Amino acid sequence: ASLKRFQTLVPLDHKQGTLFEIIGEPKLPKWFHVECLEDPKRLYVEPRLLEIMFGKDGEHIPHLESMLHTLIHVNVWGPERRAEIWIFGPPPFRRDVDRMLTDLAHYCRMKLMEIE
Amino acid sequence: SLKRFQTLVPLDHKQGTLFEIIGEPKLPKWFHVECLEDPKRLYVEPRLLEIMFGKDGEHIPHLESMLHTLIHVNVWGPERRAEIWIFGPPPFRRDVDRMLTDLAHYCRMKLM
């Protein structure tokens, strides 16, 4: 990616496109299976939404990950480029977590335009 | 955290499964009053509530918007179980029920 680094239970390196790698030797969550690292789902969001959706430095992401049983990885670049939220787990899960994050994004977008 | 927690649609908990919307709030597009006819209840130690949901439940409106489910928190003594009430349905192979008990589990552990 490029770096703002967001919090998560398992920090990953975004190597290239679909390739992610676990950084160092973290204690993994009981529900997390290394195999899920193979096919993550990506969804785009504008960058300014990231900290509204996930809190400052993505501080609420470990809670969300615990609730969803999917890893969340955030890649962010310039203000002019779309951010990428990458989601990791069983495909039956990645689909509905995808709708949840889209629904959350819709909400945060409305609040953004109201708080201004 | 308080005795009333935050939410998109503040409710009065009348008795058991019976709730009522307080006043005339603008409702979320995804929400319909008939949702209140499908409550599910979960129990939790009161101590976990502010860990799970933020001070005074300040994160609940985000959670509700993610889940498309209203969350009502009834709390009593620090002794007895708090009730979490949800008016669904779920967006995952995992019941909103299961996602919230799992959140509580994580928060129980992190509380050590």
Numbering used by the authors:
A (entry chain A): 2 to 117
B (entry chain B): 3 to 114
Give verbatim lines from the article.
FILIA is a member of a recently identified oocyte/embryo expressed family whose members are characterized by an atypical KH domain. The SCMC contains a core formed by FLOPED, MATER, TLE6, and FILIA. FILIA is important in regulation of mitotic kinase activity and spindle assembly checkpoint activation, and contributes to chromosome stability, although the molecular basis for the relationship between its special localization and its unique function is not clear. In order to study the structural basis for its function, we expressed and crystallized the N-terminal domain of FILIA ranging from 1 to 124 amino acids (named FILIA-N hereafter).
The crystal structure of FILIA-N (1–124 AA) was solved by the single wavelength anomalous diffraction (SAD) method. FILIA-N crystallized with two molecules in an asymmetric unit forming a stable dimer. From residues 40–118, FILIA-N forms a classical KH module with a β-α-α-β-β-α topology. The N-terminal 39 residues prior to the KH region form a unique substructure in FILIA-N. This substructure is composed of a loop at the beginning (residues 2-12), followed by two anti-parallel β-strands (β-1 and β0) and an α-helix (α0). The peptide from residues 2–12 is located in a groove formed by the β-1-β0-sheet and the β1-β2-β3 sheet, bridging the N-terminal extension and canonical KH region, thus contributing towards the stability of the whole molecule. The total buried area in the dimer of FILIA-N was approximately 1920 Å2 compared to 930 Å2 for the Nova2-KH3 dimer. On the dimerization surface, most of the interactions involve the helices α2 and α3. Hydrophobic interactions contribute most of the stabilizing forces, including residues Met68, Met101, Leu65, Leu69, and Leu105. A measured molecular mass of 29814 Da was obtained with a Kd of 10 nM, indicating a stable dimer with high affinity. Surprisingly, although the FILIA 40–124 (FILIA-NΔ39) protein lacking the N-terminal extension still possessed a KH domain, it completely lost the ability to bind RNA.
